Write a protein that binds this ligand. Structure first.
Ligand SMILES: NC(=O)c1ccc[n+]([C@@H]2O[C@H](COP(=O)([O-])OP(=O)(O)OC[C@H]3O[C@@H](n4cnc5c(N)ncnc54)[C@H](OP(=O)(O)O)[C@@H]3O)[C@@H](O)[C@H]2O)c1
Ligand SMILES: O=C(O)COc1cc(F)ccc1C(=S)NCc1ccc(Br)cc1F
Length: 316
């Protein structure tokens, strides 16, 4: 199929990108270099991952080497929860731009819908371990994001981990100037997100699927959690196509018209994950993979469940 999807701003976003959460600073530079060489043109970043400077070094080297031109790359970062206050949004964006060594971002996302107390700590906690919320509401944060488009810092703005009521709040904002281009959410065969995806797609919002392999390096993994990569039913579908299970898990969201951003720092796996354009899962394989849904979420956090804007109390 097409390798890019059209956003509501007229820009084309590559459907496969490289994730960078948990990529150590001493390895992410090489990872990104190898990815660009092999053909990736979309990199998913965030300030909170604490490695944007090192991503930036990789991007600059490949621009300087003339392997790629800036306009061919699609670089995404995210506004952290401690910067939801209207006056802090621009500064947070500029810090990211400085670390990545760029003069504009292609897409800037609100990372989570919940605002936290501003400060140096990414997760400010109270004396009993609850996250300290800020009194900012998401509509005011959105207005600040829209000003970054007008100022030329970012080409498109979007959201991440927003449920459908939270998306609706933005779409019904008085004076809405730029609709969200993308909603980046957790999506894989154990959390298929049919309802939320259909909602978003109906509204012309592109969905990006994160943790498509089930994030087996997540820091809070437990020894007897489910493993997608070792699910024997998925292994059988892979075997039938002579692909790896990872390749099947990456191709899956592509055929649902989603963008997908697997993470790897391993050069062989970076190349393997890119070889997904030469095969098709059947309708039958797609429906079967959808049937494996268990509403199991990698990305959730108990310390934040008391926040009024925590997204996962809703059905979708
Ligand atoms: N918006 C948000 O809230 C949100 C939250 C979570 C994730 N994200 C984004 O989504 C990206 C992807 O999600 P994720 O990092 O949670 O995990 P993921 O991409 O589902 O899985 C990463 C794990 O899979 C391993 N892996 C990669 N390709 C493989 C292959 N071909 N065979 C076997 N193992 C393979 C990686 O190993 P190696 O690295 O050792 O090779 C790593 O341990 C993140 O990096 C981040 O950019 C955004
Ligand atoms: O968030 C990422 O992209 C990947 O995850 C993270 C990435 C980081 F670099 C630091 C913490 C997280 C965590 S703990 N994310 C879980 C989480 C954070 C805030 C809220 Br509201 C709910 C929630 F579930």
């Amino acid at each position: 199929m097409a390798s890019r999807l059209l956003l509501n701003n007229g820009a084309k976003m590559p459907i496969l990108g490289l994730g960078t959460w948990k990529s150590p600073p001493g390895q992410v530079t090489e990872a990104v270099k190898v990815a660009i060489d092999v053909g990736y043109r979309h990199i998913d970043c965030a300030h909170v991952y604490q490695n944007e400077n090192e991503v930036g070094v990789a991007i600059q080297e490949k621009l300087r080497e003339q392997v790629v031109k800036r306009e061919e790359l699609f670089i995404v970062s995210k506004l952290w929860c401690t910067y939801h206050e209207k006056g802090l949004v621009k500064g947070a964006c500029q810090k990211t731009l400085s670390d990545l060594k760029l003069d504009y971002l292609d897409l800037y996302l609100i990372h989570w819908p919940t605002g936290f107390k501003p400060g140096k700590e990414f997760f400010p906690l109270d004396e009993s371990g609850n996250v300290v919320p800020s009194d900012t509401n998401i509509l005011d944060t959105w207005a600040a994001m829209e000003e970054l488009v007008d100022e030329g810092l970012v080409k498109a703005i979007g959201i991440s981990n927003f449920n459908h009521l939270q998306v609706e709040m933005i779409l019904n904002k008085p004076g809405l100037k730029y609709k969200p281009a993308v909603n980046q959410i957790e999506c894989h065969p154990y959390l298929t997100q049919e309802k939320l995806i259909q909602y978003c797609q109906s509204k012309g919002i592109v969905v990006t699927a994160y943790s498509p392999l089930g994030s087996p390096d997540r820091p809070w993994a437990k020894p007897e959690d489910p493993s997608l990569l070792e699910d024997p039913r998925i292994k059988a579908i892979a075997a039938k196509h002579n692909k790896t299970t990872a390749q099947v898990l990456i191709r899956f969201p592509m055929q649902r018209n989603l963008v997908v951003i697997p993470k790897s720092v391993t050069p062989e796996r970076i190349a393997e994950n890119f070889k997904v354009f030469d095969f098709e899962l059947s309708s039958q394989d797609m429906t079967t993979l959808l049937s494996y849904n268990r509403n199991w979420r990698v990305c959730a956090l108990l310390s934040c469940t008391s926040h009024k804007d925590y997204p996962f109390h809703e059905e979708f």
